[PDB]
Amino acid sequence: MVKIIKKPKDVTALENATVAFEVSVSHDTVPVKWFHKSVEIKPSDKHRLVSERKVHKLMLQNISPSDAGEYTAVVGQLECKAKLFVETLHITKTMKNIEVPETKTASFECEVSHFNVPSMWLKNGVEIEMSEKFKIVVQGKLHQLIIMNTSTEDSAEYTFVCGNDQVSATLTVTPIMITSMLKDINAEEKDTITFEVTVNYEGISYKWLKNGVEIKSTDKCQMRTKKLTHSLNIRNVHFGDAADYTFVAGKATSTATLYVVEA
């Protein structure tokens, strides 16, 4: 006269979750057994068997992928079955190897299987910390690493760790090259002059030096960019302006001299 009333249902859960299967019967104090892979389940640190009047539960704690599969409750000669599906954290979109000119920004992105995966980024196997240099971003299932102001030292293999999965890609930081170098300028007192250089990449950072000292942007000394050309325009030149000028971008430099003929 014992009847199964409510049968166990499939469970889908993340690895490391605690889950349960439940069978209910028509009578109090009916003994039950549970099976997985054709072996009877015993109480353990992983498995808890709880009977409460008509309700019988199998609880599985801290599940691993090996716990996946079909579980059977046996009540007399009556049986019922349900399955556990264990979702694991994994990569769903990989990262791209990239080449980035020095001084420019590099970025890596991947996509993962689940929300709320913690950020974990490595550079050559060593954990990276968020800083002004490294921007670490999560946007739902999208994970991004932004590397500012790249230099040779940033060329490396970068890895995102996602549970027991990981994905890697390489950054190669490429050298700025000067395709048209500075030329000397031979000027007269009160002239306005313009030094010009052309480089191979747009969007690079640079500075200008006067006898090795960084020049301040002023009305007199204007520094501008047009496409791949960078200029230093000096108004109303005098003897004090006669000097060696250097354009610097990344590891690339070009130097020329301004001559100013007086009076």
Side-chain angles (χ1 to χ4, degrees), residues 2-263:
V2 174
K3 310 172 273 298
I4 292 174
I5 295 298
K6 172 258 154 32
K7 302 199 264 82
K9 298 189 186 185
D10 287 357
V11 177
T12 295
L14 273 160
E15 184 169 1
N16 306 122
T18 292
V19 302
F21 291 102
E22 189 159 284
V23 59
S24 87
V25 296
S26 54
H27 289 67
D28 196 350
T29 359
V30 176
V32 299
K33 288 179 176 179
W34 294 87
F35 293 82
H36 176 65
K37 295 181 193 164
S38 292
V39 181
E40 180 178 331
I41 296 171
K42 298 163 282 177
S44 72
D45 296 346
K46 165 104 70 179
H47 306 100
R48 178 168 304 99
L49 300 176
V50 180
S51 289
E52 207 289 287
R53 283 170 297 170
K54 296 178 183 180
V55 182
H56 306 277
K57 306 165 62 168
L58 167 62
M59 305 174 196
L60 314 174
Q61 301 167 133
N62 193 12
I63 61 183
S64 63
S66 64
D67 295 311
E70 191 164 63
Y71 289 78
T72 305
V74 181
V75 182
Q77 300 170 23
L78 306 167
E79 304 181 10
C80 48
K81 294 169 184 291
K83 292 174 177 176
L84 171 63
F85 296 98
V86 181
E87 293 193 356
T88 63
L89 300 179
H90 60 274
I91 300 298
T92 69
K93 185 182 285 173
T94 67
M95 308 200 286
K96 298 300 301 302
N97 298 331
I98 49 172
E99 294 189 351
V100 180
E102 57 182 340
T103 80
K104 298 186 71 177
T105 300
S107 64
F108 290 101
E109 306 164 41
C110 67
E111 294 175 19
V112 302
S113 56
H114 293 84
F115 292 91
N116 302 314
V117 172
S119 297
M120 183 57 64
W121 291 93
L122 321 179
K123 174 185 181 184
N124 298 332
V126 169
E127 290 176 52
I128 305 175
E129 295 167 30
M130 276 214 85
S131 64
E132 294 281 21
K133 177 75 168 170
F134 295 110
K135 173 78 169 313
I136 292 172
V137 184
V138 182
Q139 295 184 18
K141 297 146 123 183
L142 177 74
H143 286 264
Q144 184 181 29
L145 174 67
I146 299 155
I147 306 174
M148 308 299 301
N149 189 24
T150 56
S151 68
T152 294
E153 290 83 4
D154 299 316
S155 301
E157 178 170 60
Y158 293 87
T159 300
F160 187 83
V161 182
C162 176
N164 301 314
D165 207 355
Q166 68 173 54
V167 60
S168 299
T170 63
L171 169 62
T172 305
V173 181
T174 54
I176 293 162
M177 301 188 180
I178 291 166
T179 65
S180 191
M181 293 163 177
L182 286 179
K183 59 182 178 162
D184 285 352
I185 295 174
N186 290 268
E188 291 171 305
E189 180 177 333
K190 303 180 180 170
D191 283 352
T192 291
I193 64 92
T194 305
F195 282 107
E196 303 179 85
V197 286
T198 304
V199 296
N200 61 340
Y201 299 122
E202 188 159 66
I204 52 89
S205 294
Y206 68 90
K207 65 192 173 183
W208 293 83
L209 315 178
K210 176 186 183 181
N211 299 328
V213 179
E214 183 180 334
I215 301 171
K216 182 189 174 181
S217 172
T218 63
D219 289 335
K220 182 179 166 103
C221 296
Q222 298 177 23
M223 286 156 289
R224 297 190 179 275
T225 300
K226 293 180 53 59
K227 304 331 281 75
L228 302 170
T229 300
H230 303 276
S231 61
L232 166 63
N233 180 259
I234 307 181
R235 297 175 175 188
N236 192 21
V237 297
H238 51 64
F239 169 83
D241 298 300
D244 297 334
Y245 291 84
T246 303
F247 171 85
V248 179
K251 299 186 279 74
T253 66
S254 178
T255 300
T257 301
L258 173 61
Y259 298 94
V260 180
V261 174
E262 294 182 276

